[PDB]
Amino acid sequence: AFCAPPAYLTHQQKVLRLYKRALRHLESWCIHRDKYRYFACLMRARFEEHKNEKDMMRATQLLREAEEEFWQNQHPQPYIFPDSPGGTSFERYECYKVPEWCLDYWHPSEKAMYPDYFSKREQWKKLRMESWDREVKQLQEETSPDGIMTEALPPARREGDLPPLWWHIVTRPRER
Amino acid sequence: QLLREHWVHILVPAGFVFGCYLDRKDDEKLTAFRNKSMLFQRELRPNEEVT
Amino acid sequence: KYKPAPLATLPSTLDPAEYDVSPETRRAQVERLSIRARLKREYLLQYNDPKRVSHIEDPALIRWTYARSANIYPNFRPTPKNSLLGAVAGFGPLIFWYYVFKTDRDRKERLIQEGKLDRKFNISY
Amino acid sequence: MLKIILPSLMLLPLTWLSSPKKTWTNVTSYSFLISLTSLTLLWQTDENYKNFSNMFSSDPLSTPLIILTAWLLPLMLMASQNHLKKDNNVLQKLYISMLISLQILLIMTFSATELIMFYILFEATLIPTLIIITRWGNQTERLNAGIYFLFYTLIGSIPLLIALILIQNHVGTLNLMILSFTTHTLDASWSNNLLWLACMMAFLIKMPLYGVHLWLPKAHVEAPIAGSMILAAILLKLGSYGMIRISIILDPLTKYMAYPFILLSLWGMIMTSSICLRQTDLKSLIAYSSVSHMALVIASIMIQTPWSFMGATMLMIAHGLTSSLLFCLANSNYERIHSRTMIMARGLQMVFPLMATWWLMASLANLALPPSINLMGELFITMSLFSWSNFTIILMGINIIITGMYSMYMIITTQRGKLTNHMINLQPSHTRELTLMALHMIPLILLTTSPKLITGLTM
Amino acid sequence: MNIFTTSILLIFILLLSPILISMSNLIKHINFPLYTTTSIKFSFIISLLPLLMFFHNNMEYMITTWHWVTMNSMELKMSFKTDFFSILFTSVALFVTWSIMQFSSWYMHSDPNINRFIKYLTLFLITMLILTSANNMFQLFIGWEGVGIMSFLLIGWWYGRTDANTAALQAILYNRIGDIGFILAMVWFSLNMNSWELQQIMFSNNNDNLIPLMGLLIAATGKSAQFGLHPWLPSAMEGPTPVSALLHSSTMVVAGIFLLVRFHPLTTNNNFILTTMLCLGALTTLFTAICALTQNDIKKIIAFSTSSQLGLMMVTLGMNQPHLAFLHICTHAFFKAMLFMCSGSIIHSLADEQDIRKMGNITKIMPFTSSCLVIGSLALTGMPFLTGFYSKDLIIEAINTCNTNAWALLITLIATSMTAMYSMRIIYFVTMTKPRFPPLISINENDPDLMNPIKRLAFGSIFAGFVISYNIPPTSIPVLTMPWFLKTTALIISVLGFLIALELNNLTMKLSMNKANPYSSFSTLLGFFPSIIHRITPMKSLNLSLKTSLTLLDLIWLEKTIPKSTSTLHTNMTTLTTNQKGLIKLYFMSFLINIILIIILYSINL
Amino acid sequence: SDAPPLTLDGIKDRVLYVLKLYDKIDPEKLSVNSHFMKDLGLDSLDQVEIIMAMEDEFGFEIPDIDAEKLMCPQEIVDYIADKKDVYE
Amino acid sequence: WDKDVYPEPPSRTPAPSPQTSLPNPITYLTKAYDLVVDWPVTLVREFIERQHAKNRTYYYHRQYRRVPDITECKEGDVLCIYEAEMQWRRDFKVDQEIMNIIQERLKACQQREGENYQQNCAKELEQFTKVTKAYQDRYLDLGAYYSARKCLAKQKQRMLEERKAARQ
């Protein structure tokens, strides 16, 4: 969920995603893992049959019939993965997933204890301001005037210096 | 010194005093019907001066 | 099989207008991508901008609020079906409720004048 | 009564001459002393009403408002002590003086007998409010808001005055309880009907119906915490008190001079409670809720039943306090952010762990969770309206439901989601604002405990 | 006559004490969960005494502790009615809550705000005890709404589980839709009898008194689970299992039925209610049993089972066996709670996988919870002597023995079968097939705080039903004269359910590929009723609240009408009266017109 | 009843266990960087089924955006480590 | 506690017939309670009552002299009207409290009679219906601005109707 997708897609990924979805819904239909393996092998054969074909006509036709068959023979109540959407743990801990900047407003009587950890925050923030302005020119120099960009982010082409825009990713709290 | 600062705390008490005094003056007015009513008409027992 | 609806839209895959391979449509998609990437980058140059002591302003949010709150009467132009729906909502239901209440009260009044309606225990009212 | 007023007339020069470092604390504590002394009125041993002169008086229906006002003064002060912090000492002193003048006027009017004195005070309430709203707002439309406020109020004021004159001439005097002991009945013609109108129209325009609820949101939004407080708490209540004290004469007209107003009040309660669902602006939501409850107040005032009057007073006091509290909370969340919008700040309760329990304890009092004077009033009023007709429980219930809905919608779009990540300006709770919340709440507890004080004329 | 009230107030004082401690500063030093658990234990030991004195005297009691107000011939006061119902419900609820508190103390480690959780639980408990042992309908409304809000909070304890917020909103909406009819009843009684108390209401045993009964009926349908307003019970499961049990196995749902039964005296002289209590409660024994055949979530299945049992009890009420209904509440609570307890143990042992579809071999890998789960499953089926029988089978006697509507009887028996059906479904999919769960394993159940509670609850679920059925005063007159095919119907039909479930679960194998059939899809999707209701009703209501009211009335017309009209009008008149140019040649002509006017007016008027 | 967290050695041993129990093409000797499509001549089907087996082995789910791009056991492990925040 | 006001019917207590070979728990239970709890409480109560008696204080009951009524009260004049209306408010309040007393005694009778409330709990219901017809014919449709004048108009209209009925 960190990297971002492209605008358009390709037949390749479309078919892959249909495959994974159908196999999950089959794991849900047919509970026993033996039956799941059996029917998964059957679906694999169904695919490998038309695999080598390349004609966009047959591609689109088979794909749009496959999606209809899938939507018409899918599982009403599928198998959701707890830690992912739909489950019974999604966001369950966000009520505890506080960010860091709540720290600054601590009271000194409290950060009195936990002294070591606060002895290292400064040298971390210090690791941010000293290398921020540079992280901008790396883009404002490479902000290709062509003006056709994606959401990707280039690394530190230099050594020693840090990458650009690491704050909103580093310091992201645990999952617990 | 300090009274120029710590005297202001005398007004409000003086205002309350003045208020109670003004209400006392009003109630001393309207003294009519002191005991002429028809539901609290006493005999003015001895040594018990008027309300 | 399946049909669309105002609630259960036609899901992503099945949409015939998807799977299109038009160069113009793909170019539109990539333009949307350029836009969205510029936006996210301008946003991330502030989410992490150090020396910051404040929050971010959401101008989309502000404009949405403006359009829901105060841009209404100026761009408002009265027309029929609009005046009509307004007069309806402002008159009809009040008058329906009113006929109801008046009929009920007159029933109660004539009943009592006859001297019938059992009012025992209606001591507090 | 002078014992309540004179000190409130001394807080002014006190404020003027006191030094900056000390005026706040001095005036605050002394206003609290005034609030304390304001309880002498509660020594209502027997039923003989209190009368201090031909110029003042008290009553069970007025005393609550008096104490509530003398106790909302200092809360306005305190809630007005973090903003205008970079405004000059003279300006903040002006602000204090305006607040105090409001207090004094409200006391004198809720006490006075002669409705003409009541009226001049009811109309002098404006100047301080208009000023507070124009000279200390935070947006630009505050001007139009003040204009609407003023002119609605004065349009109401005029025919009220004309009818007071007609009365003072036909009848000999205007003093209350004399109006009672020498009232009479009217031939019930168009003349007396338009008289009923010219007498109630102002009080209604103030206590908003569906038709004229327009100046409330603009005020409560463009205006600051203190103006919002005082509006939602008292400047509405003035209309209710006037109507109660004056309807004593217009019998029987108010049997058939009510159907339109009752209908409007109920329908407006419903439509405004609905809008409270989809109204972004938090303070606007609160204002429309206030409209929804004052509609109940009005429907209970008209039909003139004792249960109805006691429920009206209960709900009146309850809403006053609860709305002041909700507005404190809104302001609080605003000073840290500077945007009224509900959907911007979300998923709190991870950094303001306590404050929530000052958010919660308000909603529960809005949606009529018992045991609360709120529900007692709503319920007695629903009883009176059921007696007056069997087909009003419908609207009572629709309103109850939509309230139970939007109160929680408000709780959940500000204290139930997941925390944003660009609101670094979340200065933790101030002891001051926590104190304001606690002070708005605790009296609700004590009155839920012993409400015999807060009943009304009939009890 | 002094020990009694002493105990009845002491239990409330005990439950208060922790809450008070919550205010104080000791919690950071003290084990609040154990504190509260033990206070609850002693509250139960206290509550027991009333039971002994009551079975030994059968003397009900009525009390008026505190006088609140005097509102002009309609007073108010904290009045209790310690009769069979409440004096027994207190003991049952505490016997359950002690175990639940131990289970929580064990199940919610690694969570910081556990003391907060405990305080919330005991607050709900106080409110429910109030509702139970209360007499004034006002006190009862207090209990009602306090229970509602406590359930809201508890479903939302994890205030990031987005759908949990919506579940809580569902709950509040439906509980308010019940409160509507409840206030209706309060008002009707305060008018037609001047009082709110059951004592002075019993004298309505002669009149039509139908509107308040409809009100209490809607209140039941709301706070409990019935046809129109069940959908809020399955979603609560999004919350934790301890509360999903306490607040949704023996409390917050039995409240409506408790109310109806306390109001039974007026329900024996209304032959309409007696009927509508069957076309409303028996139906739910079908519209949920259906949904209790394909649902995979343990908690959802259990909740649908609970709705089924509650519909059954509303049915027996309709046909006038209220003490039977109450006994069934009591018994039902025990095992319907032990099931959620075992399920929570299972889950916490695993990585938060409610789904049966990813568990198995539970017997071997975990004998204790499986034995207890089988106990509960068979008890709910109606095993002859497991505290289920002692109410369920008398109920199934009466249902066929009385003049009960045909379709109602029929779907009720069908549901009595579907009980065994989905019970054996649990059994098979969780306890008899292969271990389809992940490879890693960190099982642990040898902890006492989780092994003792289930033990106590099993002893209870096995004994208390019998004990009560033999110790309570024989309220009603039974019917013990019928054929065997009507005295043993529940037994026979549950055995049928066992056989059928075995056949079908074994058919699940054999490589018999599945097919999305509409009956089963319906069952799984609840019947599409939520899928349409919660997707049109909100949309239309909100779109109306926006289009008509906000814009088309409160921002457009009520402004274009009064203020903007006045503005335009005065503006135009001012434009006119100051469009004047400075020309005397014109001003004087105007003066002349005015002079003419005045002369003519005087001439006419003489 | 919480078991202990996951470490890199455990993750690596498990992943090798699974990719070895695999039968299609793996010659039972997988280099940590034994590229699937390049260094083992695998198929997209096989890679996707591997990702799915890993999802089942670790409970959670891997989104498509990264399932399609994972082409190294070391990359899978780096992903899991940056998702569960291991190795304090 | 005026028992003539609150009846408190007798208490036909039953007798103990413990025919078994097992001991009554209540015996020992209530014995231990009455032992440990009532002893200190009773001693403390005696202490408090002794302090009371040594520093005793009395207080009387306010007796409001009577006055003329609205009838013998000329219109326009007020003083009389006030001294009548307040007396009337007192009477109104007293009647309301009487209603409360009736209702309390009624609920008592009901519970104390248990399931036989339909037979033995019918006497008090008659007092109730009678008292309530009175309170109705007196204070039913006045209005929150109720007062002696409106009550008198009610009485007078009712008298006129009854008299027209009698004459025909």
**DSSP H helix total and E strand total for chain E:** 27, 2
Characterise E64 by phi-psi region: left (phi > 0), alpha (psi -120 to 50), beta (else): beta
Write the CB contacts of D363 (distance below 8 Å, at least 6 apart in sequence): D407, D408, D410, D411
Rounded to 5 degrees, φ, ψ at F49 are -65, -35
Q: Is the dihedral of CA A99, A105, A108, A109 positive or negative?
A: negative
A abuts G (3+ Cβ pairs < 8 Å):
no
- Experimental technique, in short, is cryo-EM
Query: Which chain D residue lies closest to E147 (C-alpha atoms)?
Result: D369
Contact between D379 and E183 using a beta-carbon 8 Å cutoff = yes
Contact between A95 and D418 using a beta-carbon 8 Å cutoff = yes
Query: Which chain G residue lies closest to E265 (C-alpha atoms)?
Result: G115
Nearest to D411 by CA among D358, D375, D371, D351: D358
Interface residue of E369, E440, E447, E450 to substitute, partner F, most F CBs within 10 Å:
E440
Rounded to 5 degrees, φ, ψ at E80 are -115, 150
Q: CA E474 to CA E480: how far, in whole Å?
A: 14
DSSP D251-286: TTGGGTSSHHHHHHHHHHHHHHHHHHHH--SHHHHH
Class of residue G56 by CB neighbours under 10 A (exposed 0-12, middle 13-18, buried 19+): exposed
Give the SS3 label for residue D91: helix
Interface contact D214, partner C, CB < 8 A: no
Question: Nearest CA to CA, how far is G48 from chain C (Å)?
Answer: 43
Question: Nearest CA to CA, how far is G66 from chain D (Å)?
Answer: 16
Q: What is the tally of structural domains in chain F?
A: 1
Q: CA B4 to CA D343: how far, in whole Å?
A: 52
Q: CA B45 to CA B40: how far, in whole Å?
A: 14
Residue D27 contacts residue D11 (beta carbons within 8 Å): yes
Contacts 24+ apart (CB under 8 A), D184-193: D185/D251, D185/D252, D186/D250, D186/D253, D188/D252, D188/D253, D192/D250, D192/D253, D193/D253, D193/D257
Give the SS3 label for residue E62: strand
DSSP C65-120: HHHHHTSHHHH----TTHHHHHHHHHHHHHHHHHHHHHHHHHHHHHHHHHT-S--T
Give the SS3 label for residue C22: coil
Write the CB contacts of A138 (distance below 8 Å, at least 6 apart in sequence): A154, A156, A157, A164
Class of residue E263 by CB neighbours under 10 A (exposed 0-12, middle 13-18, buried 19+): buried
Q: CA A136 to CA A46: how far, in whole Å?
A: 51
User: Residues in chain D, how many?
Assistant: 459
Q: CA G121 to CA G129: how far, in whole Å?
A: 13
CB-closest option in E142, E173, E545 to D371:
E142
Q: CA D370 to CA E142: how far, in whole Å?
A: 5
Q: CA E315 to CA E281: how far, in whole Å?
A: 5
User: Residues in chain B, how many?
Assistant: 51
SS in 3 state form for chain A? Answer: CCCCCCCCCCHHHHHHHHHHHHHHHHHHHCCCHHHHHHHHHHHHHHHHHHHCCCCHHHHHHHHHHHHHHHHHCCCCCCCCCCCCCCCCCCCCCCCCCCCCCCCCCCCHHHHCCCHHHHHHHHHHHHHHHCCCHHHHHHHHCCCCCCCCCCCCCCCCCCCCCCCCCCCCCCCCCCCC
Contact between E549 and D275 using a beta-carbon 8 Å cutoff = yes
**Domain region containing F3:** 1-88
Residue D402 contacts residue D277 (beta carbons within 8 Å): yes
Half-sphere CA count of F21, side-chain side, radius 13 A: 9
Q: Which amino acid is at D228?
A: S
Contact between D419 and A98 using a beta-carbon 8 Å cutoff = yes
In 3-state terms chain C splits into helix, strand, coil percentages (rounded to 5) of 60, 0, 40
DSSP B1-51: --HHHHTGGGHHHHHHHHHHHHHHHHHHTT-TTTTTSSSS-----TT----
Residue F2 annotated to the active site: no
Class of residue E24 by CB neighbours under 10 A (exposed 0-12, middle 13-18, buried 19+): exposed
* C-alpha triplet G2, G98, G5: angle, nearest 5°: 20
Give the SS3 label for residue D297: helix
Nearest to D265 by CA among D314, D212, D308: D212
Q: CA C39 to CA D39: how far, in whole Å?
A: 61
A abuts B (3+ Cβ pairs < 8 Å):
no
Interface residue of G62, G65, G86, G90 to substitute, partner B, most B CBs within 10 Å:
G65
Half-sphere CA count of E547, side-chain side, radius 13 A: 12
Residue D396 contacts residue E183 (beta carbons within 8 Å): yes
Write the CB contacts of E389 (distance below 8 Å, at least 6 apart in sequence): E382, E383, E465
Q: CA D374 to CA E235: how far, in whole Å?
A: 31
The catalytic position among F13, F43, F56, F64 is: F43
Which residues pair with residue D392 across a beta bridge?
none
Q: CA E70 to CA E86: how far, in whole Å?
A: 27
Write down the residue that tokens 């006493």 correspond to.
B42
Give the SS3 label for residue D115: helix
Q: CA C63 to CA E413: how far, in whole Å?
A: 61
Question: Nearest CA to CA, how far is D2 from chain B (Å)?
Answer: 5
Write the CB contacts of G102 (distance below 8 Å, at least 6 apart in sequence): G124, G127, G128, G131
Write down the residue that tokens 């209809």 correspond to.
A68
Contact between C54 and D264 using a beta-carbon 8 Å cutoff = no
DSSP D18-59: S-HHHHHHHHHHHHHHHHHHTTGGG---SSS----SSS----
Q: Which structure tokens are listed for C59?
A: 């101008």
DSSP structural state of residue E77: E
Q: Which residues of E touch D418 (CB under 8 A)?
A: 160
Q: Which structure tokens are listed for D185?
A: 């009945």
Q: CA D428 to CA D434: how far, in whole Å?
A: 11
Which residues pair with residue E61 across a beta bridge?
E82
Q: Which structure tokens are listed for E338?
A: 């032990």
Question: D429: how many CB neighbours lie within 10 A of its CB?
Answer: 16
Which residues pair with residue E75 across a beta bridge?
E70
Contact between G86 and D251 using a beta-carbon 8 Å cutoff = no
C abuts B (3+ Cβ pairs < 8 Å):
no
Contact between C122 and G140 using a beta-carbon 8 Å cutoff = yes
Contact between C125 and E191 using a beta-carbon 8 Å cutoff = yes
Class of residue G16 by CB neighbours under 10 A (exposed 0-12, middle 13-18, buried 19+): exposed
Q: CA A26 to CA A74: how far, in whole Å?
A: 8
* C-alpha triplet D207, D212, D214: angle, nearest 5°: 100
Contacts 24+ apart (CB under 8 A), A21-29: A21/A70, A22/A70, A23/F49, A23/F52, A24/A78, A24/A79, A24/F52, A25/A70, A25/A74, A25/A75, A25/A78, A25/A79, A27/A79, A28/A75, A28/A77, A28/A78, A28/A79, A28/E357, A29/A75, A29/E514
Cα–Cα distances in angstroms (integers) from residue E434 to residues A23, A33, E240, E501, G40, in the given order = 20, 9, 27, 17, 67
Q: Which amino acid is at D373?
A: I
User: Residues in chain G, how many?
Assistant: 168
Q: Which amino acid is at E290?
A: I
Q: Which residues of E touch A95 (CB under 8 A)?
A: 158-160
Nearest to E168 by CA among D367, D409, D370: D409
Rounded to 5 degrees, φ, ψ at E51 are -65, -45
DSSP structural state of residue E366: -
